[PDB]
Structures are given as C-alpha cells and as structure tokens.
C-alpha cells in the first residue's frame, strides 16, 4: 500500500478523472477515471486512490474545492502522489 508518484499531462478535456471527499476526515479520492484520458493511460491511477498531493501541495486535509483548484493550477505536467486506499474510499 505504498504511495506512488504518477506524472500525467493535461489534455483538452483535462486530466481525465474526478474526485470526491475532502470533508469529515475523508481525504480526496479518485472517483471516476475517464477512458482514454491521461489518468487512464498512466496505468497508475485507479478509482479509490487517495490523492495525497499534486505538484507537492499536500491535499491530505484539503477541501474538495481546494483539491479541484490544485488540479487546475497544476499546469500541463501534473505530478500526483496517490495511495490506493480502497477500504476508505
């Protein structure tokens, strides 16, 4: 259950995933992976990954809005530290 570093590049549509959580002690979790999008084709992101950071910005205790912002401001090369945490998701 080690965390992993994933580097994805943004596409017209975006990074290709959605997130949930950010509240009540729940972290930011990947809820949806868009087929064929960058998150999908990383081969390293899954539904149920907790996003621990984005370009080094800690999102462990971040609100959903904070996390969305971080993903948008991360630019064209997005480095995600994710940890697969299905029990919690």
From Swiss-Prot:
Q: Which domain of life is it from?
A: Eukaryota
Q: What is known of its domains?
A: The PDZ domain 3 mediates interaction with ADR1B.
Q: What is the protein named?
A: Disks large homolog 4
User: What is the originating organism of this protein?
Assistant: Homo sapiens (Human)
Which stretch of the full-length chain is present here?
309 to 397 of 724
Domain (PDZ) ranges: 5-85
What is the associated disease?
Intellectual developmental disorder, autosomal dominant 62: An autosomal dominant form of intellectual disability, a disorder characterized by significantly below average general intellectual functioning associated with impairments in adaptive behavior and manifested during the developmental period. MRD62 is characterized by mild to moderately impaired intellectual development.
Cleaved signal peptide residues: none
State its location(s): Cell membrane; Postsynaptic density; Synapse; Cytoplasm
Where does tissue-level expression of this protein occur? Brain.
């Amino acid at each position: 259950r080690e965390p992993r570093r994933i580097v994805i590049h943004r596409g017209s549509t975006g990074l290709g995933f959605n997130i949930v959580g950010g509240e009540d002690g729940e972290g930011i979790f990947i809820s949806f992976i868009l087929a064929g999008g960058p998150a999908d084709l990383s081969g390293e992101l899954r539904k149920g990954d907790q996003i621990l950071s984005v370009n080094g910005v800690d999102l462990r205790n971040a609100s959903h809005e904070q996390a969305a912002i971080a993903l948008k401001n991360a630019g064209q090369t997005v480095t995600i530290i994710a940890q697969y945490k299905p029990e919690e998701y």
